[PDB]
Structures are given as C-alpha cells and as structure tokens.
C-alpha cells in the first residue's frame, strides 16, 4: 500500500466489497522512457480504484462517508467510457512523440482503462510544440511534454515545479 | 501556494489577473457541490495572455517554487451546450454555470470551468442519469459526490 489512506481503508476491508479489483498505479505498465510525461498526464488517477460494478462503488462511497476515512475516486468498469479516436496527421507534426495509450500497457481484458484514462491525449517534445500544435488542430485533447508540462483539452497550462 | 511566489512578484507578469477562488461568487446553498465540482481549479491563475503564462512556467521552473495551473483568457475554451430534458429529470438541481457568478467580462470562465456539468440530489440520481443520457458531462451531488464525464466516481469525508 504505502499511500492513499483512503484507498488503504477501502482495501483493508476488501471483503466488504466484491467487485473490487485494484488501484490503477498497480495494474499499469509504463515505458520508463516517457514515464514522467505519462505521470503528469495521469495526475491523481494513479490512485483511482477500479471496481467491476457501480454497486460496489456506491458501497465504498457510503462506506467512506460513514467512517469518514477520506475521499476516493472509483472506476466501475461497467460505467466508464474508453472510446477514443486518433487524429490523422498528428504523427507527422514536429515534436510529436505519440499517443498516451500507445505508451502504456494493461492486463489484456482491462484494455478499456487505456482508452478511459487517456483517450487520444498526446505527448510531445516541448511546451512550444504543444502550444503550437494545440493552436493548429484546435485539439480538444490533452497534450503533455516530455518536459512534464501539460495542456488541458480546454487550454489550461500546467508546469514547472 | 506556489501562487504566492507568483503573485509576490506580480510585477514580473503584466497579463496577470487573479486566482479563481477570488474572482468567483457561489450561492452558499450548493456551495459544497460546486466545490467538489471545481477541485484544484479553485487555485487556477487567470492570465490575459499565453506569453505571461509561459513566463510564469519559466519563472517557477527556475526558482523551483512549485507547480501551478494557468488560465490564459486568450487560449481557454468556454463553449458548452445544455441538454434538453435533464431539467425534467428526477433529482436534477441545475447546471454549474447557472449556480455561479463572474465579473461580467470574465463570463468565459464559467463555460470553461464548468460547461454543461450538472448538480443533483444524490448519487443514485447521478448514476441513474449518467446511464440514461450517457452523459459525457460531469455530475456532482449535493452530498459532494462526483462522476467524471467518463464515469469516474469520487466521494467521501474528512
């Protein structure tokens, strides 16, 4: 565990929840190369709890609400959406590294998560590229730089610790 | 707080405006709902131009004062569309935008910060409703819960 404490409470009573599966960070494999890019791209979702059914999700919510052990985000595989579409041409753009999904691996059946957690979100060399590209294809998608910066699908820029 | 470093040197940044939480008015009633709906964005820095944003990023990167999220009024998108029918749904409370106020010109932010995202009575409602209109929109409950546009459920207490 080492983390969440809200997630911990949830798992150290896993019996109470049938549909339970695992927190994202655990059931995900990311190519060390662009690990940092994916990381910022993920954000808090690295601690999302994946459950099989919504009922178990509500059970957790109600559970935490009682014990007040904190707040969490649950991902019911039966409700979440993993659809997404690539954009023809981005691959030839300058600075273009690749799509999130293509830079991550998920245990066979849990293929959805990729689509869900990322979708068409992309990675690039630098901020300038991200900006310059978001301006072009008026991307409503997310773009993170190898440097660690990020641009929301809506245009919010985050970076530089 | 990295915002502090950014403001306590505000001179370095011309296009600067203000952090969200400051320049926003929310009807105390469903304050909690809006709150979870906002999330970290309550500390987003609103700048006029992108250049100023890049300046801050570069500024923070140097001083290592921490990370922030900047909202260039010249890049952000505040477009959004309501959904016919949701108003007559059960549990339905209202759209985020309608439950918040922004200093005239900064009308964008509402559309940006929220869009069509909605508020409802309870989780059951939210779920039940996301299933119906297969909402790709966000739904928060007066109780404080939330469902991402993609279906991520968040809730709890402290």
Is A161 an 8 Å CB contact of chain B?
yes
CB-closest option in B61, B148, B150 to A160: B61
**Residue partners of B125: CB distance under 8 A and separation at least 6:** B89, B90, B91, B92, B141
What residues in B contact A61, CB-CB < 8 Å?
Answer: 123, 145, 153, 155-156
Q: Give SS3 for B113.
A: helix
Cα distance between residue A85 and residue A120, in whole Å: 6
Cα distance between residue B51 and residue A26, in whole Å: 38
**Residue partners of B4: CB distance under 8 A and separation at least 6:** none
Query: What is the number of residues in chain A?
Result: 161
**Cα A138–Cα A94–Cα A151 angle in degrees, nearest 5:** 45
For residue A51, give Cα distances in angstroms to A17, A19, A73, A105.
9, 5, 10, 19
Q: Which of B139, B155, B122, B120 is nearest to A65 (CA)?
A: B155
Cα distance between residue A104 and residue A68, in whole Å: 34
Distance from CA of A48 to the nearest CA of B (A): 8
**Residue partners of A3: CB distance under 8 A and separation at least 6:** A47
Q: Which of B21, B22, B17, B20 is nearest to B56 (CA)?
A: B17
Phi, psi of B12, rounded to the nearest 5 degrees: -55, -20
What residues in B contact A75, CB-CB < 8 Å?
Answer: 151-153
Cα distance between residue B94 and residue B57, in whole Å: 36
The approach used to solve this structure was X-ray
**Cα B57–Cα A139–Cα A151 angle in degrees, nearest 5:** 20
Residues A58-84 as b or e (16 or more Cβ within 10 Å = b):
bbbbebbbeeebbbbbbbbbebbbbeb
Q: What resolution in angstroms does the PDB record give?
A: 3.0
Q: Which of B148, B61, B69, B135 is nearest to A76 (CA)?
A: B148
Cα of first residue to Cα of last residue in chain A, in angstroms, is 26
CA quadruple B132, B135, B141, B145: dihedral positive or negative? positive
Chain B, window 114-143: residues with a beta carbon less than 8 angstroms from a chain A beta carbon: 123-124, 127, 130-131, 136, 143
Is A70 an 8 Å CB contact of chain B?
yes
């Amino acid at each position: 565990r080492g983390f969440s404490r809200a997630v911990r409470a949830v798992f150290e009573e896993k019996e109470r929840f049938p549909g339970l599966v695992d927190v994202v960070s655990n059931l995900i494999e990311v190519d060390e190369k662009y690990s940092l890019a994916v990381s910022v791209l993920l954000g808090g979702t690295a601690q999302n709890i994946v459950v099989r059914n919504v009922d178990t999700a509500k059970a957790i919510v109600e559970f935490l609400k009682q014990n007040e052990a904190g707040r969490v985000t649950i991902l019911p595989l039966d409700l979440i959406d993993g659809s997404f579409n690539r954009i023809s041409g981005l691959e030839n753009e300058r600075g273009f590294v690749g799509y999130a999904v293509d830079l991550v691996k998920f245990p066979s059946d849990l293929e959805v998560l990729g689509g869900f957690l990322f979708g068409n979100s992309v990675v690039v060399e630098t901020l300038d590229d991200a900006i310059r590209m978001k301006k072009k294809y008026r991307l409503n998608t997310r773009i993170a730089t190898l440097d660690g910066e990020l641009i929301s699908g809506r245009g919010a820029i985050t970076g530089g610790r």
